[PDB]
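In the previous chapter we treated chains in isolation. Here, by contrast, the input contains two separate entities that must be folded as one system, with a combined length of 124 residues.
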Amino acid sequence: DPILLRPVDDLELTVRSANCLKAEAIHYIGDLVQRTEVELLKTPNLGKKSLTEIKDVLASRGLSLGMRLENWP
Amino acid sequence: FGIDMNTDYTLEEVGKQFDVTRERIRQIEAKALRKLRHPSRSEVLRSFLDD
């Protein structure tokens, strides 16, 4: 899908989450959604609000965490 | 700009309207522009630039 290879640039996220994901260094979401909840809570200095925001931006476009992919990217 | 009003205003008149210096107003304008530049608020907008 073109969108999970669409950068976190275009998630319309807040810059706090920007710092979190820059630390994690996940540019596209095709590997983002295979990661679980604790794999996101392994973030440096990241808590409930930013992660609820990221699940918000996922379920705005019809996705979430934990999904499985094949030959990605 | 003059968007849907009378005369556009300099930054200082705007800071007057919000009790800020013009630098505060430049920060606000730049942040709003950066927000709008991204698609999902800008797909149709940039399509108005038909080229």
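The two ends of chain A are 10 Å apart (CA to CA). Chain A touches chain B through three residues (CB under 8 Å). Compare these points with the single-chain example from earlier in the chapter.
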